[PDB]
Write a protein that binds this ligand. Structure first.
Ligand SMILES: Nc1ncnc2c1ncn2[C@@H]1O[C@H](COP(=O)(O)OP(=O)(O)OP(O)(O)=S)[C@@H](O)[C@H]1O
Ligand SMILES: Nc1ncnc2c1ncn2[C@@H]1O[C@H](COP(=O)(O)OP(=O)(O)OP(O)(O)=S)[C@@H](O)[C@H]1O
Ligand SMILES: [Mg+2]
Ligand SMILES: [Mg+2]
Lengths: 32, 333, 98, 333
DNA sequence: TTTTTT
């Protein structure tokens, strides 16, 4: 159970802002 | 048959609402002239371009924030001076208790006409702002450092006493009681905010602004002003390079940026902004470090170009009208 | 167990959804999951979550000959840490989940 | 018509605010004498020149920070002595618990009249400062090493306990509750800060100051004082060469530097500053290592020139007054 | 809501 922040980080250009509304999930439930 | 009955019912309901609450209680959005967005210049042409509508919106709420010595008070005093040059009445609610009247005069502010208040508590400041808005005779109101909007309970309290979100509740109630009054009276309320650090932020901006979250929602425009350099006359630091980001905009496209120089004792360098905008709009030619206008080499470098354009008011005015006509997305009537 | 397989510091590991396509040659594409370890110091050539002038970016960190943020796409250009640029690295990407 | 109604509404609102809160709640900035900036000497003429307004502003917050043994306490004690020579009452909050009364007396501080407090906790220190500001009988208050302003919870805790930003909360609340009281009572509050290291900073200044960010916003003048060398009488180190850089200024132009000598047991070398300012202002001629005043060769080297100038009071006062009317941008009334 | 720390 680790944070999955709602906002997506833009790898192309520096994003205008990064809010961090925090959603939490575990690896096993997220991928399996 | 059915449509006629629906129209009759709608007309009866509208008439009942108008009788109950007033003539302007409800009307079609297209024929509501009071809802039109009217703007005033911020003292920076590039910022007027970045705001889309040509300046800060009248009758709204605007938040300005940034780090220390980023130029919040100087930008606010330029806004106030620009408003006062048009005959508007402005008020400065300085909660920081750190206003210099001499410097305000040096920026072009008519200190003989600017209302200044040193409120003891945040509630007193917000009540003064509410009264000034309800009067309708004040066009611009500025609250300096809403971080200093201390509640009366905290003032009467001790250092270290915990007042959880009490300032936030006071600010929320102030926004609720102020939005309608400001819209009715066509008064622009500018809030100046400081930046606090956010602890335990794994990802995201670790900076908030004091006062809570209500100011984030109620602000029509939120500006993030930062100092990104210094202006040097060889050795002495005579000014600062400033970048202003419009992180929120309810009247135009947001996230546009503006760059301008704040000169100490003079304020925002308008003529340098004119130079930069003319260069960008293919009106002033830049050949390396050489600036030229219509073939005539006006100088070498931004400072020399600014001095030359200051020395020739006619061409400065010409380039100013050309830039205002071309760049402004929403030219004011 | 994926947690023991991929995560070294559970208390300082967060997931990030990638956006954009400037890291395709580096293995990161739009929509991919980025596992970031914030407890480890960044090094030259590492993939980091970084913020330049308050604007967040995923980029490759270089410290020589100058401090810059370089992408992994031929279309995009490097970001040079210029005067009054505050490069805040918020962790190192250790895994990419597609 | 419309203008007259606006003036009537504005006057009515001003009267309402004055009745609700008080006579001085709201008034025009031009006719508000409580907002005039009053300054007091810092004990160094070069520092007064660099500050523009002639010294540290009264009724404001000033932060002085630097590395270890840079002269923060010495500069503060010189400020206190200069204030006391004018009959003012000064207070020293020694949170570091490292004040030597004999050395303070050696700098000219009236020990019998200096209110000294050694608070146990940071909350106690800030509450004592708030009470002294509210009393109105204290003109200068100094908080020694706000890095030592440890909160009560940290004191009652254990070593290794994480009190994350608690000092920042306490200091922010202190600024919020203290700005207005200091402005009302015309009290100068000097905060002495230590310098810590920002780990992991690749580009930028790696040095930060303790207490958080509130002091950065609220301080009217912030001084970075550093030791740049030693003053030697042949072999023994009798003093230190000190540079003070004004990193923030809310009363004049910032980023000016002041260089002076702090002699152990004597304080800031005023006469050496007089020598340097006379040389710079074309009052004292310097021919290589030879200094001359109006043709008379006065001595060989800075130390010999300073000793000459000590040996005569008349042209000492002459050069001092000439420098004061020449270099001082904002002479005090 | 509140606020860095080395
Ligand atoms: N009286 C003054 N004379 C000269 N320069 C000044 C004066 N007051 C402020 N400045 C400088 O002008 C720039 C902007 O000043 P401000 O408007 O006070 O900035 P600020 O955003 O209000 O920062 P704060 O309020 O102190 S946190 C800074 O570089 C200041 O050092
Ligand atoms: N009692 C004293 N007698 C002689 N010299 C002293 C005395 N106390 C301090 N000094 C010297 O005076 C210079 C400045 O001292 P301070 O003003 O205490 O420095 P500081 O800024 O207070 O740094 P701190 O507080 O020790 S971290 C240093 O060179 C000290 O060694
Ligand atoms: Mg301000
Ligand atoms: Mg000390």
């Amino acid at each position: 159970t680790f944070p999955l922040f709602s906002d997506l980080v833009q790898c192309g250009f520096p994003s205008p802002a990064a809010d961090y509304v925090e959603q939490r999930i575990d690896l096993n439930q997220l991928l399996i | 048959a059915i449509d006629e009955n629906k129209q009759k019912a709608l007309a009866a309901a509208l008439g009942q609402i108008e009788k109950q609450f007033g003539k302007g209680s409800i009307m079609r959005l297209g024929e509501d002239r009071s809802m039109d967005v009217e703007t005033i210049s911020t003292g920076s042409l590039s910022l007027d371009i970045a705001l889309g509508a040509g300046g800060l919106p009248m009758g709204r709420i605007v938040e300005i924030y940034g780090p220390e010595s980023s130029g919040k008070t100087t930008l606010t005093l330029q806004v106030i001076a620009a408003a006062q040059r048009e005959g508007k009445t402005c008020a400065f609610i300085d909660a920081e208790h750190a206003l210099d009247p001499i410097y305000a005069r040096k920026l072009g502010v008519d200190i003989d006409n600017l209302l200044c208040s040193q409120p003891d508590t945040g509630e007193q400041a917000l009540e003064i702002c509410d009264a000034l808005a309800r009067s309708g005779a004040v066009d611009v109101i500025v609250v300096d450092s809403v971080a200093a909007l201390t509640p009366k309970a905290e003032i009467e309290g001790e250092i270290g006493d915990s007042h959880m979100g009490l300032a936030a509740r006071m600010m929320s109630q102030a926004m609720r009681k102020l939005a309608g009054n400001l819209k009715q009276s066509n008064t622009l309320l500018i809030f100046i905010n400081q930046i606090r650090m956010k602890i335990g932020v794994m990802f995201g901006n670790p900076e908030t602004t004091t006062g809570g979250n209500a100011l984030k929602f109620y602000a029509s425009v939120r500006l993030d002003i930062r100092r990104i350099g210094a202006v040097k006359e060889g050795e002495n630091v005579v000014g600062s390079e400033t970048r202003v980001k419009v992180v929120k905009n309810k009247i135009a496209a947001p996230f546009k940026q503006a760059e301008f120089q704040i000169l100490y004792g003079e304020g925002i360098n308008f003529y340098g902004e004119l130079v930069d905008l003319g260069v960008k709009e293919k009106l002033i030619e830049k050949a390396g470090a050489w600036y030229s206008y219509k073939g005539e080499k006006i100088g070498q470098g931004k400072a020399n170009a600014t001095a030359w354009l200051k020395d020739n008011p006619e061409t400065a005015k010409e380039i100013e009208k050309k830039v205002r006509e071309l760049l402004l997305s929403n030219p004011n009537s | 167990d994926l947690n023991q397989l991929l995560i070294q510091h559970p208390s300082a590991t967060y997931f990030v959804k990638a956006s954009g396509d400037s890291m395709i040659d580096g293995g990161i594409s739009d929509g991919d999951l980025l596992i970031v370890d914030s407890a480890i110091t960044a090094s030259h050539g590492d993939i980091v979550i970084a913020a330049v002038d308050g604007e967040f970016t995923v980029a490759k960190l270089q410290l020589r000959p100058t401090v810059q943020l370089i992408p992994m796409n031929s279309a995009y250009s490097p970001i040079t840490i210029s005067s009054e640029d505050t490069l805040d690295v918020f962790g190192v990407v250790i895994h990419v989940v597609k």
